[PDB]
Design a protein around this ligand. Structure first.
Ligand SMILES: Nc1nc2c(ncn2[C@@H]2O[C@H](COP(=O)(O)OP(=O)(O)OP(=O)(O)O)[C@@H](O)[C@H]2O)c(=O)[nH]1
Ligand SMILES: [Mg+2]
Ligand code: NA
Lengths: 171, 1041, 274
């Protein structure tokens, strides 16, 4: 039960920081731009057994895109990420969604607003609506404070299998 | 041997085919594949044909090849030989033909086909009208011959529509888009017919859905005649809405049409609504439990439900009053509102937020019509009273069901999270603006409107639900919580007198229920809720001292309650109450001889006994809101002495021991204590305000002595054994004393009100103990919070600390700068913080810069440039503001201004352009254009002198206009002179219309990615030139007098 | 009216734990109700008559020691301490059948030394500190120790008030005079339990108990204590150790005993370099 999960979004959105926390539990404070893509297996233990996400953490910066949409090929789900401290990143979402689905017809896609821990929220929850019409799931997350940390994965896991009652149990 | 790179070894395609397979399946060596394939793209593509022309992991490779080709078309197209364009042009169309003309194309993933299509769209984008005149006629024709060809074409036309309308901005210059825009409009009729023909004579379900899906993208822009003047709305509702496999796309279309403004098409909209409802009443019986249907639904009926919720909400939003004003439509309105109510019971957050958006809208609308309750129960004098506003009448009974909805599903008012910080500390973090908290605000607001329109209905609904808890056994914690959250949400929506009667009823029976239910689990839940409720009604408490006192004493009792959560509840409520009722604790109340605060301060220990450290801090903060309400300075000062007597006792004990032996300041337990003492002081400080000076002035100097003792410890430890020493208790705990010392400091100054006093007494000691300590720590030991602390004190003291800016900058400037100038990645918190301080200096202490040596000033400006070149979005824009504020500041210093323009103006320009044209900085566009606009506008009159050294010929404007063109020239040689000259000229014309300036910068970033050549001349360098002068005419019309 | 009734209902009929004469609230003499009571002599006799020993304090001391889990005994670290009630109905046989323990201002805690380390927990089972101690089982799987202490901040000293488990043997089933006796003979000769060291950062010191005779009470009330005095606890000599509140121990504040029967600002304290 392995699943390919591409992680896209603007630069500095916290994609790599997010993935890092799930694997090591450490919080990286620095922003070292991702170069093309880097594949990270993530394992979760669920009521029904272990689930493994091969997270293709892709680059959000234009200069380091790499194979771009080429990475999406054969993806089975995805997380579109933006930073609620930066209005620009949300506005680019439709571009990230476009690229992804033109490659991936029907896959579960979660939309995540990262950094909700920063008191100076610029992308108000009221403005976050793009996911409605694309039939996508949305979650506020913080990699720093671990707020709604697993929500994207639990949802994706529930959709990829066929079990709404499925739950992460942790060992 | 993977040292193999692609050049002209006249190489094979099986090898490439092999790496491509690894790129998608292996581990480390799979990073080399990527490395290899992305690395290969340097030279060029003499292989595109080779690969695509020769094949699992063939498509993957042809895809890659298609990728190589797309770069070519989007960047080289214009300078590619005409015969090569045609060749590729025909090669692509051929590739499409055969690939789609294969029934096994269904597994040769759309990935390949779609990509192929996007490639044609790329070509179309570069020459659709000019050198492809027949294209649109042709494809419609082809579509009428082959169903298969029609299928794929509907796909192509949808991609075109997206690139030309939905996504043109950013990827296309404004004038190119405009031309492609009204080009596709000019011959759209032709394809609307193809669509209509397909729709009506249809039989190919795949083709129909595609045409349907291509239709969804046209609705974004196609003239509204095509929409409201055709059989379209009808074909949708009658033909495709009632069939399962078209049910979704169909509704989504209706929703887009529904989103338009009713003005010119009252008829149609009404009809759209009428038909939809009928077709809907058959698809979903008005008795079906949607919540259940959804819950046990699949991936197709769930999206239908949601979509249904989007259609209903959008239509009622835009055309709502149109359904009201007509009497023949009021039935279907009640049916639609009923659907809203069923769908609103779906237990799925995103669907609920959609419905909630409408309910909030209706309520807000009816509240704007009239925010009052109707007359008493009987209509005096017989006749049915006229109180009821016209619109509200139609909703009476739905409003009631909505109230019931708000009460029944009320969201959690508070988002608390357990969070471990940058240390082994695990406190409770309260979120501020989460989607969850927003749901709550919005439900509250909905309920709050509806309570203004009929509070009696709100109180009857809330009362019934309460009784169903007490006896009606609708009992449960989830439900009692939800009832009490609702009950607490409407605080202040009733008149104080109704509020009283209502609250006496709500809590008399929660109290009664509490005694009824057995088990601490139940009593703890019930108890917490009464406390939450009381906490939400200060006005009540405020008017009834005997009850207030009883609640507080009762809260003190529960601070000894062991049952999980209660103590947190008790303290949380206590702080709400101490804030909101602060005066009632400091003034003698009726039936009392002494201020209640007194009784509290004589028992602090007996009360906090059992509380954990964090709760103790909250408790101290609580009492501080009280103490800060006692405005008689003599009494207040005595209050503050007693209040801090416990912490002071420990602190004094520790200070005595450190006098004889600085080693205890190294004792784990004592530094543990020191941090908790300081955390107490910060709370106290935050609560009391300026008057706290009494206490901090008492510990100030010793606190700094210990601060610097701890700072030297940490540094020596790091110097001895490297940063690693940092991941361990004692050091981490020493960081904490330091961090809390700086928070206490900035925390108090922030709130002080005697600047000269702060500058003369509290600032100087900082220099030695804090800033020179920072300078003397080894880099990995320097507390970044020192910089933000200083930033805060500068934002607050302004001119009063201007004189000390030099000493300060001497401590931390160059040393900090050296930690962050070798790269953009290391020491993140210093980068952020160093620039917050520079902003505060620039902002509130600008004369300091006119005080320091030109070489010093230069270093300042270079740091600013350094900041705005940063990749971390925060730093860069902090750098753009500072530069904006600094330029504005300079304009105030006439003397130095001219010397600043002579020395720096052009330079600053180069640095900004280097960032504009850098695709890693588009997040700073607004400020880039904002800064350039201003500087060019400044060229008009601002610079009094000569920059080039010959005044006449090189008039400042000419000089820059030339300096900048030449700048863009050598930097981007591929641009033809006309592009450049048009762009630099517009910098001056649009220099007063920033949003235009923006788009104009955006235009340039598109062009520089694309080698136009010297031949191509489709830049419309005349049509833009009029828009520039049109923006130039407005200039004087913008700013004359 | 309805406000006064409300106020009297909130004060007198609102409790999660519902026990009598709780020290969580002020002395019932200052509260002109329902979870208070002037009777204690009777409930005391019953509870002593009740000490027929049917709970397995062997298995419970073990669970605390090894964190292995689940009237009925408390599971986990909350509610492990035996809690006094206010001393209201004074024992007619006080002077011969009870002792008084002078108590320090500090935090009450359950101490569990097990498997190489020591933990302190509040009544609410909140871990306030994990550390090394010279308690058997504290460090350097059969020897675990469980104490009832008051942690005093200024002296960094856990003042031990009672023992429930020593060197792996539970003491719940013992009378308090014995418990108190065992405590003051065993603590004094554990290497340096009363001393501050890297292996024993926190000092443990047993509190003294004294007779409740009329003359004695006057003297301890005139003694000097190494700490700030919080109150006096009165233990019935014969009571087992039973977590939860009980009338078999009573609480008084010191003042209660005599009633019932007896040129600008600041300068440094550390004068280091400015
Ligand atoms: N405050 C806060 N900062 C965060 C959070 N998540 C990430 N960051 C910061 O944002 C930056 C994110 O860095 P990355 O995750 O590497 O950026 P990215 O999304 O991978 O961007 P690219 O790799 O260039 O595509 C780091 O400096 C993090 O410290 C968060 O949840 N809260
Ligand atoms: Mg990344
Ligand atoms: Na008693």
């Amino acid at each position: 039960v392995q699943f390919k999960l591409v992680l896209v979004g603007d630069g500095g959105t916290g994609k790599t920081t997010f993935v890092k926390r799930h694997l090591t539990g450490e919080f990286e404070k620095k922003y070292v731009a991702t170069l093309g893509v880097e594949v990270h297996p993530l394992v979760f233990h669920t009521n029904r057994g272990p689930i493994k996400f091969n997270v293709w953490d892709t680059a959000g910066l234009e200069k380091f895109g790499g194979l771009r949409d080429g990475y999406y090929i054969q993806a089975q789900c995805a997380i579109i990420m933006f930073d609620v401290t930066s209005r620009v990143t949300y506005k680019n979402v439709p571009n990230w969604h476009r690229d992804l689905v033109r490659v991936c017809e029907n896959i579960p896609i979660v939309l995540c607003g990262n950094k909700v821990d920063i008191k100076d929220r610029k992308v108000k929850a009221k403005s976050i609506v793009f996911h409605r019409k694309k039939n996508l799931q949305y979650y506020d997350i913080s990699a720093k404070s671990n707020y709604n940390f697993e929500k994207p994965f639990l949802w994706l896991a529930r959709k990829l299998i066929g079990d709404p009652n499925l739950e992460f149990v942790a060992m | 041997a993977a040292r193999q790179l692609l050049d002209f070894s006249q190489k094979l395609d099986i090898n490439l085919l092999d790496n491509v397979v690894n790129c998608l399946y292996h581990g480390e060596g799979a990073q080399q594949r990527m490395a290899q394939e992305v690395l290969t793209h340097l030279k060029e593509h003499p292989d595109a044909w080779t690969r695509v022309d020769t094949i699992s992991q063939n498509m993957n490779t042809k895809y890659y090849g298609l990728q190589i080709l797309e770069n070519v078309i989007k960047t080289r197209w214009k300078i590619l030989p005409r015969n090569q364009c045609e060749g590729i042009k025909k090669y692509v169309v051929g590739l499409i033909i055969k690939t789609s003309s294969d029934p096994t194309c269904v597994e040769k993933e759309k990935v390949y086909i779609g990509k192929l299509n996007m490639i044609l769209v790329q070509i179309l984008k570069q020459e659709w009208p000019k050198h492809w005149p027949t294209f649109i006629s042709d494809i419609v024709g082809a579509s009428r011959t082959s169903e298969s060809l029609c299928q794929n074409n509907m796909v192509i036309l949808k991609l075109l529509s997206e690139e030309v309308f939905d996504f043109s901005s950013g990827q296309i210059t404004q004038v190119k888009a405009k031309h492609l825009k009204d080009s596709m409009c000019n011959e759209f009729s032709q394809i609307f017919q193809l669509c209509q023909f397909v729709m009506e004579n249809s039989q190919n379900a795949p083709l129909v859905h595609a045409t349907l899906e291509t239709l969804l993208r046209f609705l974004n822009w196609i003239p509204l005649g095509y929409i409201f003047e055709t059989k379209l709305i009808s074909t949708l509702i009658y033909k495709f809405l009632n069939v399962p496999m078209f049910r979704n796309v169909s509704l989504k279309c209706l929703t887009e049409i529904a989103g338009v403004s009713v003005s010119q098409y009252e008829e149609q909209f009404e009809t759209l609504f009428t038909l939809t409802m009928m077709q809907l009443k058959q698809m979903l019986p008005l008795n079906t439990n949607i919540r259940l249907a959804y819950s046990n639904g699949k991936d197709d009926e769930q999206n239908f439900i949601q979509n249904l919720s989007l259609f209903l909400c959008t239509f009622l939003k835009e055309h709502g009053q149109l359904l009201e004003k007509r009497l023949n439509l009021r039935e279907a309105l009640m049916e639609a509102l009923h659907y809203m109510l069923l769908v609103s019971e779906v237990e799925e957050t995103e669907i609920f937020k959609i419905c909630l958006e409408y309910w909030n809208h209706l309520a807000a609308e009816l509240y704007r019509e009239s925010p009052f309750s109707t007359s008493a129960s009987p209509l005096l004098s017989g006749s049915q009273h006229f109180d009821i506003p016209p619109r509200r009448q139609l909703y009476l009974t739905v409003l009631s069901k909505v109230r019931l909805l708000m009460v029944s599903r009320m969201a959690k008012p508070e988002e608390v999270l357990v969070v471990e910080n940058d240390q082994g500390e695990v406190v409770r973090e309260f979120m501020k603006d989460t989607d969850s908290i927003n749901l709550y605000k919005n439900m509250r607001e909905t309920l709050v409107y509806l309570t203004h329109l009929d509070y009696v209905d709100t109180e009857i609904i809330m009362t019934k639900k309460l009784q169903n808890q007490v006896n009606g056994t609708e009992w449960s914690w989830k439900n009692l919580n939800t009832l009490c959250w609702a009950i607490g949400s409407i605080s202040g929506a009733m008149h104080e007198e109704d509020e009283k009667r209502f609250l006496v009823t709500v809590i008399k029976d929660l109290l009664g229920l509490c005694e009824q239910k057995r088990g601490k689990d139940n009593k703890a839940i019930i108890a917490s809720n009464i406390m939450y409720i009381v906490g939400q009604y200060p006005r009540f408490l405020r008017a009834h001292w005997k009850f207030l006192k009883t609640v507080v004493n009762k809260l003190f009792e529960f601070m000894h309650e062991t049952h999980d959560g209660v103590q947190d509840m008790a303290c949380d409520t206590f702080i709400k109450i101490a804030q909101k009722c602060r005066r009632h604790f400091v003034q003698v109340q009726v039936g009392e001889v002494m201020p209640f605060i007194d009784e509290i301060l004589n028992n602090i220990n007996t009360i906090i006994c059992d509380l954990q450290p964090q709760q103790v801090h909250t408790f101290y903060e609580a009492v501080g809101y009280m103490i800060g309400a006692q405005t008689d300075q003599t009494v207040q000062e005595h209050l503050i002495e007693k209040y801090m007597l416990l912490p002071n006792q420990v602190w004094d004990s520790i200070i005595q021991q450190a006098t004889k032996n600085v080693d205890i300041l190294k004792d784990p337990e004592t530094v543990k204590q020191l941090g908790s003492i300081l955390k107490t002081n910060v709370r106290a400080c935050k609560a009391v305000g300026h008057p706290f000076v009494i206490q901090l002035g008492r510990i100030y100097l010793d606190m700094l002595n210990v601060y610097k003792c701890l700072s030297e410890n940490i540094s020596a430890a790091i110097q001895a054994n490297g940063e690693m020493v940092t991941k361990q208790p004692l050091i981490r705990s020493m960081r904490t004393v330091k961090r809390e010392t700086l928070k206490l400091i900035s925390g108090w100054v922030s709130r002080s009100n005697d600047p000269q006093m702060v500058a003369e007494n509290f600032v100087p000691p900082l220099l030695d103990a804090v800033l020179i300590d920072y300078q003397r720590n080894v880099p990995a030991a320097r507390e970044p919070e020192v910089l933000s602390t200083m930033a805060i004190i500068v934002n607050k003291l302004g001119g009063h600390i201007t004189a000390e800016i030099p000493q300060i900058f001497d401590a931390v400037f160059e040393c900090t700068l050296n930690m962050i100038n070798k790269d953009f990645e290391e020491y993140p918190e210093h980068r952020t913080n160093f620039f917050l301080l520079l902003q505060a200096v620039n902002s509130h202490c600008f004369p300091a810069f006119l005080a320091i040596p030109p070489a010093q000033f230069k270093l300042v400006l270079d740091s600013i440039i350094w900041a705005f070149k940063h990749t971390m979005r925060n730093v860069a824009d902090t750098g753009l503001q500072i530069l904006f504020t600094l330029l504005q500041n300079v304009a105030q210093e006439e003397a130095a201004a001219q010397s600043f323009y002579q020395t720096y103006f052009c330079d600053i320009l180069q640095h900004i352009f280097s960032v504009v044209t850098d695709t890693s900085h588009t997040a700073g566009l607004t400020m880039h254009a904002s800064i350039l606009a201003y500087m060019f506008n400044l060229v008009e009159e601002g610079k009094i002198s000569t920059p080039l050294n010959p005044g006449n010929p090189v008039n400042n404007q000419m000089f820059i206009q030339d300096y900048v063109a030449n700048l863009l020239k050598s930097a981007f040689p591929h641009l033809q002179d006309a592009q450049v000259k048009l762009f630099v000229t517009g910098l001056f014309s649009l220099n007063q219309d920033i949003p235009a300036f923006k788009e104009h910068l955006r235009d340039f970033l598109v062009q520089i990615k694309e080698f136009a050549g010297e031949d191509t001349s489709d830049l419309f360098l005349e049509e833009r030139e009029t828009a520039l002068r049109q923006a130039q005419e407005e200039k004087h019309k913008l700013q004359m007098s | 009216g309805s406000m006064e009734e409300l106020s009297q209902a909130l004060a007198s009929s609102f409790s999660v734990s519902q026990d009598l004469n709780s020290t969580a609230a002020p002395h019932p003499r200052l509260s002109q109700k329902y979870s208070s009571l002037e009777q204690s002599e009777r409930r005391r006799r019953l509870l002593e008559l009740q000490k027929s020993k049917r709970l397995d304090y062997v298995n419970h001391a073990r669970r605390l020691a090894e964190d292995d889990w689940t009237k009925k005994l408390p599971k986990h670290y909350a509610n492990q301490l035996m809690l006094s009630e206010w001393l209201i109905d004074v024992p007619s046989d006080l002077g011969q059948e009870w002792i008084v323990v002078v108590c320090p201002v500090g935090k009450r805690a359950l101490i569990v030394a097990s498997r190489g380390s020591t933990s302190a927990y509040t009544k609410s089972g909140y871990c306030v500190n994990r550390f090394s101690s010279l308690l058997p089982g504290g460090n350097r799987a059969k020897d675990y120790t469980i104490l009832d202490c008051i942690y005093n901040e200024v002296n960094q000293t856990y003042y031990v008030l009672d023992v429930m488990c020593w060197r792996g043997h539970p003491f719940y089933d013992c009378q308090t005079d014995f418990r108190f006796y065992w405590m003051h003979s065993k603590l004094p000769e554990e290497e340096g339990l009363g001393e501050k060291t890297k292996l024993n950062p926190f000092k443990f010191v047993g509190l003294k108990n004294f007779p409740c005779t009329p003359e004695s009470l006057c003297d301890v009330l005139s003694m000097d204590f190494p700490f700030e005095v919080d109150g006096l606890l009165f233990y019935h000599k014969q009571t087992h150790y039973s977590p939860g509140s009980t009338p078999l121990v009573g609480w008084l504040r010191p003042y209660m005993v005599s009633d019932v029967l007896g040129h600008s600002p600041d300068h440094p304290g550390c004068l280091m370099e400015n």
